[PDB]
């Protein structure tokens, strides 16, 4: 029996420096976790102990911190090369800076194969991108060979910027001919490494014949066999055993997100490449594991430029950006308008004749805005100034909500109005009118929303049974500030871009900003 050790990471999201237990900025260094240097230590420890090791990434290394903002993918290429990853799969966030923002920094600098079988190219790009990403790759692991086939979320055109020259095919439909090609090459050990989510991983395991193990991402799924070592709640056992349509027991694995855990799976194979046994658990990268001094040296060397960028002028403001709690938690504030205008602009994705844009609405809780910005300091706006406004290192996510759920959210926004409570919503592409004399839960008297399936955008009343796409902070999607109706009634939720980054990009683009209080929220 030939034993294989699969080491895997997914949805790292620029968390190169060590983080807190909640994956935010490190405060107490003695109880800090994750980091690319700590991972290097654990990977090197395993490699010394096990003879057959494979380090795999299931996408979403891109987007997360100031590292991605400044180095734009070069940090991912450099540190993944240093950790000696065996193969990577393309995720949605790898297309965040367009197709050119993937080809140049990552695809051309990475010293390992980057995979995806369900991405097809057309137009002038087809010849330029051909061969830069492979559908599969046969990896020699000592005396044996292991085939790795890749896949990317079919939803990337709505979550990132791949452009009009890339087509995202159905995973099971595109994977099977590539799995069959590995079978003709007499490869009896096949891993499906991709970025489409846990539900899709289970489908590939059940329907794609020939696949022996599925290593996924996207959904930040945490699987654990036994007692969890931290705050993460297991979604199932590690591995998650799927019974395929051909009869085989197929293990499915995921290693949460933000580089907190290193996935660890031990597969036993027979001479014919059939799974005898599969066992393991994600290793918690905690304080007990020391940071490698060589990698930490590079981290600190690169961190200098990041500190220089945070004090640099991104753009100017000719208006006082009113982010005071007395304004933003009581009425329409121009800071709330600016962030929501930034949120919509960031989610402008290549649309067909069906809509001007797939998403037009934005909601942001007042308690999310933590500081104003003064325009009298030459008009200057720096990353540091924006960090005071949005300090919790959250993201701006895309959700699908029924009209009724959104009406319930606006009713929650003013249920205990006049107490400076945080649930008060700031908007974008929404027109609300409240009557505070009315009973709580029946205070929204007008709620108009900007259309999507229209060539000329205009405001129309919100329909209670119709599903609407909204950009809102991660905190709200997770039921924060009492928005339980958001968490319990959302139809779809997707991991977005970093909060500070979204607003920094918008200000840089605009050069000079002048947001006004234009009457998006009205009273009586």
């Amino acid at each position, epitope marked *: 029996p030939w034993e294989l050790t699969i080491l895997h990471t997914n949805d790292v999201h620029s968390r190169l420096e060590q983080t807190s237990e909640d994956s935010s900025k490190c405060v107490d260094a003695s109880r800090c976790m994750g980091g690319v240097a700590r991972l290097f230590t654990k990977v090197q420890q395993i490699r010394r102990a096990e003879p057959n090791v494979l380090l795999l990434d299931a996408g979403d290394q891109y987007q997360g911190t100031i590292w991605f903002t400044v180095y734009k993918g070069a940090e991912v290429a450099h540190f993944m090369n240093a950790l000696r990853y065996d193969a990577m799969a393309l995720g949605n966030h790898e297309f965040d800076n367009g197709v050119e923002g993937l080809i140049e920094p990552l695809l051309k600098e990475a010293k390992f194969p980057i995979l995806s079988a369900n991405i097809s*190219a057309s137009g002038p790009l087809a*010849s330029q991108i051909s*061969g830069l990403y492979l559908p599969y790759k046969v990896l020699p692991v000592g*005396d044996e*060979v292991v085939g790795i086939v890749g896949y990317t979320s079919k939803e990337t055109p709505f979550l990132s910027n791949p452009g009009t020259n890339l087509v995202f095919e159905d995973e099971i439909t595109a994977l099977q001919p590539e799995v069959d090609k590995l079978k003709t*090459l*007499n490869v009896n050990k096949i891993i499906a490494l991709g970025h489409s989510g846990f539900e899709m991983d289970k489908l590939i395991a059940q329907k794609v014949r020939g696949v022996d193990v599925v290593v996924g991402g996207h959904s930040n799924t945490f699987l654990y066999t036994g007692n969890p070592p931290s705050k993460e709640v297991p979604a199932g056992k590690y591995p998650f055993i799927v019974t395929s349509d051909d009869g085989r027991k197929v293990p499915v694995v995921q290693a949460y997100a933000f580089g907190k855990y290193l996935g660890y799976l031990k597969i036993e194979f027979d001479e014919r490449g059939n799974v005898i046994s599969s066992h393991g658990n994600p290793i918690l990268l905690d304080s007990s594991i020391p940071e490698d001094p060589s990698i930490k040296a590079d981290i600190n060397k690169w961190r200098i430029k990041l500190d220089d960028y945070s004090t640099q002028e991104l753009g100017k403001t000719i208006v006082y950006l009113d982010g005071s709690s007395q304004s933003c938690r009581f009425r329409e504030c121009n800071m709330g308008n600016l962030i929501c205008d930034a949120m919509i602009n960031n989610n402008l994705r290549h649309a067909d004749e069906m809509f001007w844009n797939h998403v037009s609405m934005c909601i942001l809780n007042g308690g999310g805005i933590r500081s104003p910005i003064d325009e009298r300091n030459d008009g200057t706006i720096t990353w540091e100034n924006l960090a005071a406004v949005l300090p919790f290192g959250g993201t701006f996510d895309l959700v699908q909500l029924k009209g009724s759920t959104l009406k319930k959210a606006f009713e929650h926004s003013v249920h205990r109005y006049g107490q400076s409570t945080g649930e008060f919503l700031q908007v974008g592409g929404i027109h609300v009118v409240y009557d505070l004399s009315r009973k709580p839960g029946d205070r929204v008297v007008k709620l108009d929303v900007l259309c999507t399936s229209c060539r000329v955008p205009s405001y129309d009343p919100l329909k209670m049974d119709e599903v609407y796409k909204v950009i809102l902070p991660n905190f709200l999607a997770n039921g924060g500030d009492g928005f339980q109706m958001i968490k319990d009634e959302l139809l779809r939720h997707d991991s977005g871009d970093q909060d500070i980054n979204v607003v920094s990009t918008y200000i840089s683009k605009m050069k000079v900003i002048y947001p006004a209080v234009e009457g998006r929220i009205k009273f009586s």
Partner: antibody, heavy 117, light 108 residues
Framework: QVQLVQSGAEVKKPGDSVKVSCKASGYTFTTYWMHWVRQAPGQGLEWMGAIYPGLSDTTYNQKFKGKVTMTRDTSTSTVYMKLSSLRSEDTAVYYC??????????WGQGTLVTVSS | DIQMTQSPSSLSASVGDRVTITCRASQDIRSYLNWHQQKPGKAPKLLIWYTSRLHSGVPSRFSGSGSGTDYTLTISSLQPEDFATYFCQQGETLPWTFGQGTKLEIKR
């Protein structure tokens, strides 16, 4: 390191049979494919067939079916290629190549087969 | 049987010049295009695999592009060791077929 050593140049008469060897070194012999390509003067490169030693699975080009037979010996890590009923048209430089997935990365020095009466 | 039409059949150039060799297939060979370099009386060495990916030890000056049926090999600044015969090959469907070749002669 990665090296493929082929048998010496051979001279055969029409109707004879020639057996060309290809010894492998520096890699796991059983997990790789062994291909055979011929180069005739002023005719270009022509693909003949392939063998997966770790299973003895063979695949030949329809033109060479019943004319070519590929064998292996996992002991000495040698691949043999046999050519029955030789003709003047079979006068070419025969190469053995290593393949993992996409391409034939390493080739052998070549074996010249001269067929004349 | 996929036919591989490689042009030019012969090319005369000097050290430092840009070299462009094109290869065209009768059918869409789905990016399975491999480039090989063969010196006289020697084994052909692999240059580029799957349209653009360089083989181990191949210098940065060599680059491959293309998609569907039309593919292209490029040598940015030609060197004295780069004067040899160049062959393209399709690995999409069997039997695998090679191009006629391109002889690279030193201009004097």
């Amino acid at each position: 390191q990665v090296q493929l050593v082929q048998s010496g140049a051979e001279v055969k008469k029409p109707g004879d049979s020639v057996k060309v060897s290809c010894k492998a070194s520096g890699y796991t012999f059983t997990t790789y494919w062994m291909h055979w390509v011929r180069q005739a003067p002023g005719q270009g490169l022509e693909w003949m067939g392939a063998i997966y030693p770790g299973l003895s699975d063979t695949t030949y080009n329809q033109k060479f079916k019943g004319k070519v037979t590929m064998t292996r010996d996992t002991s000495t890590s040698t691949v043999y290629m046999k050519l029955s009923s030789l003709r003047s048209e079979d006068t070419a430089v025969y190469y053995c190549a290593r393949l993992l997935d996409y391409a034939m990365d390493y080739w052998g020095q070549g074996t010249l087969v001269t067929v004349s009466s | 049987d996929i036919q591989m039409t490689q042009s030019p059949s012969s090319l005369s150039a000097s050290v430092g010049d840009r070299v462009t060799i094109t290869c065209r297939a009768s059918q869409d060979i789905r990016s399975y295009l491999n480039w090989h370099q063969q010196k006289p009386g020697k084994a052909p060495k692999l240059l580029i695999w799957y349209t653009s990916r360089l083989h181990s030890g191949v210098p940065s000056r060599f680059s491959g592009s293309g998609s569907g049926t039309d593919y292209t090999l490029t040598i940015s600044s030609l060197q004295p060791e780069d004067f040899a015969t160049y062959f393209c090959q399709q690995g999409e469907t069997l039997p695998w077929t090679f191009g006629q070749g391109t002889k690279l002669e030193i201009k004097r």
